[PDB]
Design a protein around this ligand. Structure first.
Ligand SMILES: CCOP(=O)(COc1ccc(C[C@H](NC(=O)O[C@H]2CO[C@H]3OCC[C@H]32)[C@H](O)CN(C[C@@H](C)CC)S(=O)(=O)c2ccc([C@H](C)O)cc2)cc1)OCC
Lengths: 99, 99
């Protein structure tokens, strides 16, 4: 599909057996999602943007489905104000910017 | 152009007559540039990111050329971690997401 940017590029994702809403975000290197109690091991990380840094849990090789497109990769979980699908997963669904 | 996402989508912009590098950021509503000198009036503003809120200088109706494509719109200047081009200008240059 083609998504215009008049509004935020929010889509439904499926992760950890749950449906969530997340932004398709070309400005994010990696994917950052709201607190969810996912099974398995994880590594602490700190990630920063406007306003400073937050603490997240890094989970590797997580299955995520984005608009029906399946992807597998790292997800960072913590108290983010917004869920972002970053480039690590957008590449896997073949997403480009075009103008 | 068609821009894939294996690398950061960094492009050259021209603002205030000077060239700079900036990131095309679909997860940003607004365009935020690191501290710089820009002519004309501005107004204090607050903007929120992953890490909380920061103070910026709001410059309205600013000419800016992004990867060869002209825009005229609002530019926020302040302590962003990196120069980001947000949706207010991405729409102007006809940028969509495609997968
Ligand atoms: C309930 C509402 O919460 P809220 O309003 C904040 O909401 C939002 C918070 C973040 C975003 C996405 C964020 N956009 C953003 O900063 O945009 C600003 C300017 O335009 C406004 O529009 C939206 C906010 C304002 C950007 O796309 C992605 N970022 C990096 C970018 C800045 C370049 C380094 S990142 O997220 O920092 C990030 C860092 C590191 C990683 C891993 C390591 O790779 C992944 C992601 C969208 C909405 O207030 C909170 C106090």
């Amino acid at each position: 599909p083609q998504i215009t940017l008049w509004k935020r590029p929010l889509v439904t994702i499926k992760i950890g057996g749950q449906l969530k809403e997340a932004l398709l975000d070309t400005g994010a290197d990696d994917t950052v999602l709201e607190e969810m109690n996912l099974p398995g091991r994880w590594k602490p990380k700190m990630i920063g943007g406007i306003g400073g840094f937050i603490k997240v849990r890094q989970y590797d090789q997580i299955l995520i489905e984005i608009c029906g497109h399946k992807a597998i990769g790292t997800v960072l979980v913590g108290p983010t104000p917004v869920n972002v699908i970053g480039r690590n997963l957008l590449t896997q669904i073949g997403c480009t910017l075009n103008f």
